[PDB]
DNA sequence: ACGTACCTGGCT
DNA sequence: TAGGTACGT
């Protein structure tokens, strides 16, 4: 049951950007503070990486917990048009996996930064984020993800 | 003003 | 591909 009326829910949905979202803005700011001259929204790479760091041959995705189905407190299965959302979100999850595989096949190290780690009552501190980012980017560690519990290598 | 909880279409 | 709105602070 939606907390908005049709018109309002439509307005809310129309306001959602496809780049330069809240989580992308905070990550950009963190990377800029670190002195990294990164690129963004690379339509030439699989999944159009949110961020690209050529200098360390790595890319970074900022995942919205709803859109990418993170199994965290931010995600709830829609109670309206459930079938539609389950298929759409399910397809997003499958595409996310494929994108990561392709990038790796191209020689790119991938880092996933979940939204809950960037905003919300469980978000990591600026210091904690900056440290984990700098260590992962500048290091040679394989693909990983950052959630509220810190950083972890991808399966 | 601001942080969080509650919710789940639009635009290329 | 979050972010509008209601609420408590
Ligand atoms: Mg993107
Ligand atoms: Mg993203
Ligand atoms: Zn999450």
**What are the DSSP E strand ranges found in A36-143?**
39-40, 51-53, 58-63, 109-114
Hey, how many other C-beta atoms are within 10 angstroms of the C-beta on A38? 21
Please name the method used to determine this structure.
X-ray
Question: In angstroms, rounded to a whole number, what is the distance separating the alpha carbons of residues A27 and A62?
Answer: 8
Q: Is A68 a catalytic residue?
A: yes
CA neighbor of A71 nearest in space, from A149, A128, A142, A143: A149
What does chain A come to in residues?
Answer: 155
Domains recognised in chain A with CATH numbers: 1-155 (3.40.960.10)
Which nucleotide comes closest to A3 if you measure CA to C1'?
B7
| A50 labelled catalytic | yes
Residue position matching structure tokens 């020689």:
A107
Of A142, A112, A138, the residue nearest A23 (C-alpha): A112
3-state helix, strand, coil in chain A (%, to 5): 40, 15, 40
Q: Is A23 exposed, middle or buried (0-12, 13-18, 19+ CB in 10 A)?
A: buried
- Lateral strand order in the sheet of A109-114: A39-40, A51-53, A58-63, A109-114, A144-147, A150-153
Structure resolution, Å: 2.3
Q: How many beta carbons lie within 10 A of that of residue A63, not counting itself?
A: 23
**Which residues have CB atoms below 7 Å from chain B, the nucleic strand?**
A 1-3, 9-10, 12-14, 16, 18, 66, 73-74, 76-81, 84-85, 88, 119-121, 123
Considering only CA atoms, which residue is closest to the C1' of nucleotide C4? A12
């Amino acid at each position: 049951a939606d907390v908005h009326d049709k018109a309002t829910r439509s307005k809310n949905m129309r306001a959602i950007a496809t780049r330069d979202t809240a989580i992308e803005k905070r990550l950009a700011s963190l990377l800029t503070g670190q002195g990294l001259a990164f690129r963004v929204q690379d339509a030439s790479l699989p999944g159009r990486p949110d961020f690209v760091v050529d200098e360390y041959r790595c890319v970074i995705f900022t995942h919205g917990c709803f859109w990418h189905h993170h199994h965290c407190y931010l995600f709830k299965v829609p109670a309206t048009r459930t079938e539609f959302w389950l298929e759409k979100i399910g397809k997003n999850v499958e595409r996310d996996r494929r994108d990561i595989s392709r990038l790796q096949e191209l020689g790119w190290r991938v880092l996933i930064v979940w939204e809950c780690a960037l905003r919300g009552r469980e978000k990591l501190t600026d210091e904690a984020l900056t440290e984990r980012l700098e260590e992962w980017i500048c290091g040679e560690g394989a693909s990983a993800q950052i959630d509220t519990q810190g950083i972890h290598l991808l399966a």
